[PDB]
Amino acid sequence: TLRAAVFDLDGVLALPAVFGVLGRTEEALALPRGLLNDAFQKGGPEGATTRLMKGEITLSQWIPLMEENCRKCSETAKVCLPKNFSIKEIFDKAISARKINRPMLQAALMLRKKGFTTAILTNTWLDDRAERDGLAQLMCELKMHFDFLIESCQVGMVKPEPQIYKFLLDTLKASPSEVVFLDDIGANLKPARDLGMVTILVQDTDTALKELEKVTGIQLLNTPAPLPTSCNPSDMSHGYVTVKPRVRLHFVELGSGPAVCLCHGFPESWYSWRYQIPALAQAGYRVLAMDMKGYGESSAPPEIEEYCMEVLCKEMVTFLDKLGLSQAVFIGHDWGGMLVWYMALFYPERVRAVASLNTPFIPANPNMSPLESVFDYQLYFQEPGVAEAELEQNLSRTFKSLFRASDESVLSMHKVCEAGGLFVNSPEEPSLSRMVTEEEIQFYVQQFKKSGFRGPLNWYRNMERNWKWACKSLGRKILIPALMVTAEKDFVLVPQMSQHMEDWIPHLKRGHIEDCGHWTQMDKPTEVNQILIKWLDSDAR
Amino acid sequence: TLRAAVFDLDGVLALPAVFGVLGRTEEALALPRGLLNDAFQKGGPEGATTRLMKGEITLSQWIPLMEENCRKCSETAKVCLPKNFSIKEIFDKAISARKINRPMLQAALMLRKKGFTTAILTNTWLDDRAERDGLAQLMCELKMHFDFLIESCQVGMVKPEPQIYKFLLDTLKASPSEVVFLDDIGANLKPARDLGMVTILVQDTDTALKELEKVTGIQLLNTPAPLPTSCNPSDMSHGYVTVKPRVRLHFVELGSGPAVCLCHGFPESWYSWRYQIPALAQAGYRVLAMDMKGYGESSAPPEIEEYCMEVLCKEMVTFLDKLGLSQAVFIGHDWGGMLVWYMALFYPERVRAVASLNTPFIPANPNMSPLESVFDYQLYFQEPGVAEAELEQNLSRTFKSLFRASDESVLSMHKVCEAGGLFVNSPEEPSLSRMVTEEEIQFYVQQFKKSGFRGPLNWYRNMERNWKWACKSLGRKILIPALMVTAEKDFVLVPQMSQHMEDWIPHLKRGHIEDCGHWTQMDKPTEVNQILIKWLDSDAR
Ligand SMILES: O=S(=O)(NC1CCCC1)c1ccnc2nc(-c3ccc(C(F)(F)F)cc3)[nH]c12
Numbered sequence A, B: 001t002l003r004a005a006v007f008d009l010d011g012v013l014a015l016p017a018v019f020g021v022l023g024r025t026e027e028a029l030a031l032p033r034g035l036l037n038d039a040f041q042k043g044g045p046e047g048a049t050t051r052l053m054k055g056e057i058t059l060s061q062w063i064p065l066m067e068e069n070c071r072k073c074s075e076t077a078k079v080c081l082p083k084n085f086s087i088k089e090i091f092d093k094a095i096s097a098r099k100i101n102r103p104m105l106q107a108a109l110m111l112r113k114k115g116f117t118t119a120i121l122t123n124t125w126l127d128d129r130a131e132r133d134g135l136a137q138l139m140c141e142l143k144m145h146f147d148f149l150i151e152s153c154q155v156g157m158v159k160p161e162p163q164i165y166k167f168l169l170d171t172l173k174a175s176p177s178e179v180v181f182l183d184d185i186g187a188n189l190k191p192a193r194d195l196g197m198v199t200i201l202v203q204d205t206d207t208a209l210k211e212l213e214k215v216t217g218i219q220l221l222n223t224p225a226p227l228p229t230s231c232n233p234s235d236m237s238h239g240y241v242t243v244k245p246r247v248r249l250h251f252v253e254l255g256s257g258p259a260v261c262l263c264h265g266f267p268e269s270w271y272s273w274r275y276q277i278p279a280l281a282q283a284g285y286r287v288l289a290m291d292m293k294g295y296g297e298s299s300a301p302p303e304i305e306e307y308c309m310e311v312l313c314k315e316m317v318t319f320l321d322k323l324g325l326s327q328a329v330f331i332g333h334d335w336g337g338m339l340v341w342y343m344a345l346f347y348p349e350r351v352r353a354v355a356s357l358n359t360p361f362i363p364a365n366p367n368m369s370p371l372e373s374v375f376d377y378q379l380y381f382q383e384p385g386v387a388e389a390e391l392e393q394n395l396s397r398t399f400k401s402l403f404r405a406s407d408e409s410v411l412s413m414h415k416v417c418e419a420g421g422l423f424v425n426s427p428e429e430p431s432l433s434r435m436v437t438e439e440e441i442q443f444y445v446q447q448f449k450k451s452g453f454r455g456p457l458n459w460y461r462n463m464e465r466n467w468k469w470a471c472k473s474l475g476r477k478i479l480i481p482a483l484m485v486t487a488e489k490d491f492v493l494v495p496q497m498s499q500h501m502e503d504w505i506p507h508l509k510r511g512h513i514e515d516c517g518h519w520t521q522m523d524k525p526t527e528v529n530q531i532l533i534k535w536l537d538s539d540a541r
């Protein structure tokens, strides 16, 4: 009974195999067959390549030794090499060309989802090339997905020596019989086999995946498309900034590059962006996913006025000031989308680009106060303590009833004042949505235990204030790069409401997601990530 | 009696005045005098420029209006304009060319150091140009230095209207008689004057500074060179990463750009880099100043083995992994310098560049254990509880005795075992060093109250372990960009000890600081910042 899966990197987790390039290179150059491959292996265990894989010498140190061997091995067949021949040029190109083999990673990912323990066991080098970052990026992305990564240069052992196999077993804490070993090399494969581990010779991925599926008894092939990578809160970098005495802002930080600020809606978390954080960071961005004022680890002052857009936008600018950021790409959903449109109208200097999910930008009416105005829920929210008491009564019930996809029984926003509550027609025990796990629901429950629903509800209690402030921007235009994303089945933030936006945002780029409800991020994470990344790459450098 | 100083930005805090460019442009083009200046002012209060300064319209919106006025104002003198004439081209160039007027900022900085309340009062615009970042950077850098920044476009008022002057006074909470007002415009100056505030017409800086010096009775001119900007802990972004259960790492984060990891020595803080953080962030870098394992807000496990270089380097890599960083420029001082050399030897993939202050890189001796070996202090540190008890006895006394510059009475590192203590020859009440304030000393005192000196002292108790691990790197070379910085008067980490480094680090770049003791960062902050930035710009992109 297997409980562990082990993958080689080259020719297994990453493709094309860098190894394969020696063959490609000799035949591209009209060079005698295996001359290059034999130069690589010169001296075998006492050889330059083994010293490299053992961590005795670095990659840049090894290059000259390999070139030398290329000449010594040439003497045998008496041939001469090209003038421009460069080992560095070759591996730089080979390393660069090498990518993650996605079907293989998905297979390793499924096994881990099923309680398997996974590892990467590779014969590798200490890369000190000026171009080493590319491999470092690939290595970072690969793992985060595995329980262990064992590199020969770090452990001082190589394949095929038996000590490495015994080392792998000790790390795994598994008897060989409960382990699958995947390698594209027969030699590196035998030690594991004659130790009793299950082995797969990897030639082609489908055929290798066919063998793995059969061995583990798990559907690995032709499986439906998986969800993007989520976030485990305990594994994140948590940031804390005091924007003013008694008001501190919490955020989650991941990745390097241009700053992308994520602003959630009501009643959410930085955790609403769980599917977005790894993808955008992987896309070459520095993600800062906020806990907006009143939520989670951010401060929740009792006062209503602390939640007007002018005060909220001001603190976001202070947040940038204190973080030492001249700009950030502002991305908001729901109430975050509202804030983000205001950041663009009032502070274009600090905003690289603006993106809104579901929330439309609508210019304020100078002749009518919004309080003049059945999207009844806003009226229900005005009274302090009323909506708080109902929403805080049973938190598990609150989130399960709120967080529902388009096909689920969503819950009405009309005549709620007449009904006397948001959940007055709702079951005591709501069913669990396809969007969330019980564990994910429980995160929100623990987050909302700190401050409750007062601060979040206060976001709705500044209608007249936000309206007066908005009237000042009535003559302005959004001329900075902007993206408006609509959700088909959002019945509060309807795509129709966004139709006249070009009157104020002429260069506006758009996105639309079908069969998507209000909770856009967890509804359609894959579509959201595709739209946002595409837009960031073209408009937000 | 003055207690407040107010500066205009254009022609006062920033130079050349963007205003000045209209004159430069008309005479460069052989254009009638004041044609451009008069096009700018067309309609005065009801004019396009006033609407811009009031925040009614954005900068990109205003450009077309200004071009239009340039044509209408041309009709008067009947002249024709160049084909390539561009208002955008003009202000883009003018805004870009405009810099902070350093002597003026230094003057504003001195007044604030003396208990003055300072502010910036400028007539400005909402910049939505694709090139707005430059101004946003200048604006961010300028302030951080002032109590208030009042922009006309944000407040809806302009100069010369009296409401702005009354607004400034309300923010300041000052009677006009206790305020100095500096403007390069006579018109913007009169309202403040006839309200009774002290006024300076700014033409040239020395002459304007002469007037300010006379008025406030403070030496502003020809004053000695000031210290770089320090850090106020309450104003920083604090980051927290769990690298493993029970071990969390704390850091301070400032700026955008390539990641620069700062690793302090013994017994220090992230606060040891206080002078470096703002300067490097301003230099275009993302600074991460660590609280190394055992210090401040980082975890301090009791176990000795947790402090060996192999475990410490591993956690730093995990820290990068969790932050989503493929690489970071590693900069260390003292024990941080030791760690940083090891990060390069063992993980070149994760290190963009390596920099060490005072700490030399010395290859381990395979034929001799370091424990075989009067730098007595190491021997004094081996015994658990002994050095802890002495160092923890009086924290204020510990830091004041430790943190001493070259001319101060430094304190011996020899025969300390024979003496029976580090401070056995030291006064009960040490004098306060020129390097630190009593307030800065007290920060270290509060930081060391959490974990004590055990974890930090454990860094010294892994000699044999670090030696065995180092022996594995004996055949390796540091071929990644490296900087070695020496301090003349460091008597523990002597510059002589670094002399053979090129044998292992051929491409090594160097730095040297004279009359500098062991506590390099606070000893010579200006020299340190100059060396590090220079090196980062050339070697660390
Ligand atoms: O109150 S608004 O001004 N009304 C808008 C403006 C016109 C159309 C609706 C408002 C402005 C912006 N984003 C908003 N998001 C919500 C909302 C969010 C969650 C839930 C719930 F949790 F209940 F399901 C109910 C409502 N309300 C919002």
Ligand SMILES: O=S(=O)(NC1CCCC1)c1ccnc2nc(-c3ccc(C(F)(F)F)cc3)[nH]c12
Residues within 6 Å of the ligand: B265, B266, B267, B334, B335, B338, B359, B375, B377, B378, B402, B460, B492, B493
């Ligand atoms: O113990 S080491 O191996 N010896 C070295 C190696 C050869 C020369 C000295 C060591 C290695 C690296 N950085 C070190 N920094 C200190 C040190 C730091 C502060 C104080 C104090 F606080 F007391 F003033 C006393 C000593 N010691 C260090």
